[PDB]
Design a protein around this ligand. Structure first.
Ligand SMILES: C=C1/C(=C\C=C2/CCC[C@]3(C)[C@@H](C(CCCC(C)(C)O)CCCC(C)(C)O)CC[C@@H]23)C[C@@H](O)C[C@@H]1O
Ligand SMILES: C=C1/C(=C\C=C2/CCC[C@]3(C)[C@@H](C(CCCC(C)(C)O)CCCC(C)(C)O)CC[C@@H]23)C[C@@H](O)C[C@@H]1O
Lengths: 239, 10, 239, 10
């Protein structure tokens, strides 16, 4: 009927983490290679993603219990959960009014089409928007949003994962804090938790769709040379 | 090897 | 006492090549990651160099006799001669008035110091300027400038080179056209040829100094992640 | 391997 310290301290760490690794002004985006509307958006979006990965790694490093895992398991979790963490956090900039990520003047306002100029179709780009909408509508609290990202990152079901027993416990601790929170601090959210977990299953699918499309793109050297070393390494298979 | 990813995780 | 067709046709190809691969307005530079004056210039200059390599490969592909070499020998020559070709061509933007490469407003006006913010010192950055000055003062014709780059690219003395006998003949054909040209079309340039060849020996040194400094930088993952795949690959040793 | 450098040389 009331959250305990360890839990409350878990929420404080995660929220501070997201804050130290997510800017609501999107000021660093000018440092990226400029957008251009033949895979013309590829250079900008590669920098966007590569940037975000550094952020996700920053957030992860501060997820309680994560630094305790082995370098190998940390890397296995990041690599597999990375793309999804990026989709979850991107929701912050998503705009239901225009069905696009609004991160600045018309320049940094990424709509479904600018992603196509980055090597992606619409058949697979449709579920992303479908996902960004349902997630948005959940009007999550920063606490639940931040938790969901931490819960998603500690999914034991990741190819490459060793200590799937510990990683499993951690995720359970997090899922519990998310349930208690929603229960005591989130009025009207009785179905919520279950809706949030469902969102992770969707991420799996979007994750698998990206892998495929990225695989083709990364295989063509004229395109991969547009990617950044960090991306090439995080989405690469040389594990 | 994961040169980059290793340095980043500190 | 007068150039022959094959020679004249060699000069026409090289000049057209340089033209199709060198812009005197430097308009594409806005596409690079913006400059910033902790290796703050590294992101911009990496894009500058990576860009230039694509250009050098474009020029090379059109050097007469080059496409006839084996993929392997083409790659061996590019990799080893790349950095030097970049220093030779950069001379076009060098400004003796301010001892810097002027490629745009204060933004793209790279002076000796902005390179330091890219992982380089002054002990080794001094010979580059010393070299850019002497070269500039030679007031080369576009024909001699273009030749020199072709002659430099066909230096048989490159680690990795197989057919060092053919590559050797090609370079000789080019050195001959450069001598005839200077002799019949370049009044007052009696010492010139010899001065130009000396410039290649200097490139060797600058080339060796870069290798070392780049090696350190590329070894530190926090820095290499700033480089681009093409650079990482051209200056890398995985031959 | 030189993936990139190969594609570029056509
Ligand atoms: C990044 C962030 C932002 C937006 C996210 C976007 C818009 C551009 C395209 C992205 C990055 C989607 C892309 C991945 C593209 C990368 C690459 C290398 C070109 O395969 C989609 C792949 C998913 C589907 C299934 C649609 O193919 C996933 C999330 C989308 C801005 C800000 O919120 C920070 C956040 O941190
Ligand atoms: C490129 C071009 C231009 C300028 C060249 C420059 C200025 C910036 C720094 C450079 C690129 C020098 C650098 C190499 C830096 C790259 C890296 C990866 C950071 O190690 C110097 C290394 C040489 C010494 C010996 C000084 O250390 C070589 C030529 C210099 C502009 C235009 O002319 C096109 C040309 O095409």
């Amino acid at each position: 009927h009331m959250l305990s310290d360890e839990q409350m301290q878990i929420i404080n760490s995660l929220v501070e983490a997201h804050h130290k690794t997510y800017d609501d002004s999107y000021s660093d985006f000018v440092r990226f290679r400029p957008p251009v509307r033949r895979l013309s958006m590829l250079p900008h979006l590669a920098d966007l993603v590569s940037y975000s990965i550094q952020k996700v790694i920053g957030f992860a490093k501060m997820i309680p219990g994560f630094r305790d895992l082995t370098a190998e398991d940390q890397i296995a979790l990041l690599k597999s959960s990375a793309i999804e963490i990026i989709m979850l956090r991107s929701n912050q900039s998503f705009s239901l009014e225009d069905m696009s990520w609004s991160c600045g003047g018309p320049d940094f306002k990424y709509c479904i089409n600018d992603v196509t100029k980055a090597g992606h179709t619409l058949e697979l780009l449709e579920p992303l928007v479908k996902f960004q909408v349902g997630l948005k509508k959940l009007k999550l609290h920063e606490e639940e949003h931040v938790l969901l990202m931490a819960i998603c990152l500690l999914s034991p079901d990741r190819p490459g994962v060793q200590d799937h027993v510990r990683i499993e416990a951690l995720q359970d601790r997090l899922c519990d804090v998310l349930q208690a929170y929603i229960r005591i601090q989130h009025p009207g959210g009785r179905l919520l938790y279950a809706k949030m977990i469902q969102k992770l299953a969707d991420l799996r699918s979007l994750n698998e769709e990206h892998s495929k499309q990225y695989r083709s793109l990364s295989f063509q050297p004229e395109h991969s040379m547009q990617l950044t070393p960090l991306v090439l390494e995080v989405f690469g298979s040389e594990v | 090897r994961h040169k980059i990813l290793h340095r980043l995780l500190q």
